[PDB]
Design a protein around this ligand. Structure first.
Ligand code: HEM
Ligand code: HEM
Ligand code: HEM
Ligand code: HEM
Lengths: 146, 141, 146, 141
């Protein structure tokens, strides 16, 4: 939370260069590889037997698109993340039973993916802005847990 | 590592717990669910109400596993290996939750051990539960 | 924080029985015993070599009383913990250089002391109310860090 | 535990880092200070400014220690013994901070190793930094 104006501008500028479907697929796949206990939600998704199978799995890619598309839309509401994500928060708690620590892990992986994709453009100040964003989104998605 | 004094402290405290171990495991789960609601995400199939037989049954099995770990404090990885497998590959509880349950187990022991829960014993029990936690998460990846 | 009616009541009721001086000494001493790296902030406090030395140390007892006194005062302001602790937050960051993780560790040791001292009266619902409070106070003390 | 495949992945990736290891350690430190400002509480009398000699010197020492660990990956507790004493007995950095630095080191590697930072290598590196962190906090209590 608590982006400065220039940090907001930095986030928006970088994101305008992101292929959301591609980064979403890559981030969710890497989540399932690096933190494989996150596979617990995806037993119906078919082959997760190797890193290549995970990264190549069409259902993993499709879910990544869905997740990062909602993340992307949320970037338009950096001053109201709790409101924006409230109904998804209730869903993730009441029906999906997703431990919000998963949101934090996905945030870590997304930051590593943006670093990988953008290289030196993903500067320390840009990373710090994105860390505020991923913390804020995770906190918002966790807020209606009970 | 667990020092010999730690092991002595743990054996003494758990020995006093005795036949109440199952009760205290259940109480620790209840404390965890109330204090840290995100942990409920792992039990959508349980009645979480106070007195729940599902909570009692879990508490008993957890207690028996800890009893076994205390009896095998020099060889904990092997004693807990089946449970390390279960948590790593089936239950897939995020490792952050083990610190939450450990705290609630400590709180439960504190609430039931007026004489035994000295600062030194508290320190040893905290190290013991962190070690059990480490063992239980050692196969996650 | 957001306490239920039952929770604010639970907090107030238990706190009426707390000898803030004695509990504060006990909680600070236990912090230094259970997480002994925390002694890094108390180099001038004298003998911290053994658990009995820590628990009996007059400077540890004196400081515990001051720390839990400020905690106690804050319980009158559960709705405004950030504003209430802002001055002490800035002090702990800018002058004392205390990692706010320490506030979390102290919260959990305080909860352990309350359980040890009060026994069965420190029920799971009373604990839950105190967990919200110690998280709220730690976050309020962390808030002005930069 | 590091798998034999993790050790292979780490030796390859760190070999590629090569002579840039010190620069990367300094960049990781800066990333950590900016992303997680509470970590600055450990460096209250450091010149934290971008490019400072103190930041560069820390980065070089951390890099050398990681190089030692990678070279001696089956014997890390002995290899890192002096540093585990230093962190446990003197610096006394709260263990939570090791995850923060490790994330920043991983981000730094990602930003500089586009060819090498595959999913499997990312996992191995993450495990490696977690293992180094464990060794560095092993003597805390
Ligand atoms: C940035 C964080 C996240 C966002 C914005 C997000 C968003 C979404 C959205 C928009 C949906 C679809 C809801 C619907 O169909 O009505 C969804 C479903 C789902 N999400 Fe999340 N999600 C996030 C993180 C996660 C993570 C980390 C996990 C688990 C590791 C997860 C597990 C699931 C599952 C299991 C479903 C149901 C999928 C299905 O039924 O096919 N989500 N999420
Ligand atoms: C000291 C730490 C722990 C120990 C010793 C332990 C031990 C056990 C044991 C003995 C069982 C029963 C296994 C069986 O039925 O075959 C079990 C199951 C289970 N545990 Fe763990 N556990 C620990 C921590 C955790 C934590 C932190 C969580 C989540 C917050 C968790 C969630 C579960 C769940 C969901 C089950 C399955 C319950 C059911 O469906 O009946 N455990 N554990
Ligand atoms: C609820 C949490 C805390 C509160 C409300 C609090 C409050 C205070 C107060 C009121 C003082 C000034 C006492 C005076 O008037 O002399 C103080 C000083 C100090 N506090 Fe905190 N404190 C908290 C936690 C901690 C923790 C966990 C640590 C470190 C482990 C810490 C480290 C210190 C230090 C080093 C000083 C200066 C001691 C000296 O005079 O040498 N505080 N704190
Ligand atoms: C991969 C994890 C780490 C490694 C390999 C590492 C390694 C080292 C090394 C080699 C030194 C220099 C020792 C000397 O000059 O004798 C050092 C010093 C130091 N480290 Fe660690 N470290 C790690 C984690 C951390 C973390 C997480 C923090 C705080 C967030 C930290 C804070 C410090 C501080 C404050 C110094 C002293 C700096 C000075 O005043 O010169 N370290 N570390």
């Amino acid at each position: 939370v608590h982006l400065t104006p220039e940090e907001k501008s930095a986030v928006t500028a970088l994101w305008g260069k992101v292929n959301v479907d591609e980064v979403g697929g890559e981030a969710l796949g890497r989540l399932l590889v690096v933190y494989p206990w996150t596979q617990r939600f995806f037993e119906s998704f078919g082959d997760l037997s190797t890193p290549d199978a995970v990264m190549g799995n069409p259902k993993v890619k499709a879910h990544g698109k869905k997740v990062l598309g909602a993340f992307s839309d949320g970037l338009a509401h950096l001053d109201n993340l709790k409101g924006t994500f409230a109904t998804l928060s209730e869903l993730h708690c009441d029906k999906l039973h997703v431990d919000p620590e998963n949101f934090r892990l996905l945030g870590n992986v997304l930051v590593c993916v943006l670093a990988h994709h953008f290289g030196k453009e993903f500067t320390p100040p840009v990373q710090a802005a994105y860390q505020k964003v991923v913390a804020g989104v995770a906190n918002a998605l966790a807020h209606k847990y009970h | 590592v667990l020092s010999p004094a730690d092991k002595t402290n743990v054996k003494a405290a758990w020995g006093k717990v005795g036949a109440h171990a199952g009760e205290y495991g259940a109480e620790a789960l209840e404390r965890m669910f109330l204090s840290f609601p995100t942990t409920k995400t792992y039990f959508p199939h349980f009645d979480l109400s106070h007195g729940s037989a599902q909570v009692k049954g879990w508490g008993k099995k957890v207690a028996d596993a800890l009893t076994n770990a205390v009896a095998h404090v020099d060889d904990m990885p092997n004693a807990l290996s089946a449970l390390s497998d279960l948590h790593a590959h089936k239950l897939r509880v995020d490792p952050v939750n083990f610190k939450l349950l450990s705290h609630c187990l400590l709180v439960t022991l504190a609430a039931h051990l007026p004489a035994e829960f000295t600062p030194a014993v508290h320190a040893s029990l905290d190290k013991f539960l962190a070690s059990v936690s480490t063992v239980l998460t050692s196969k996650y990846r």
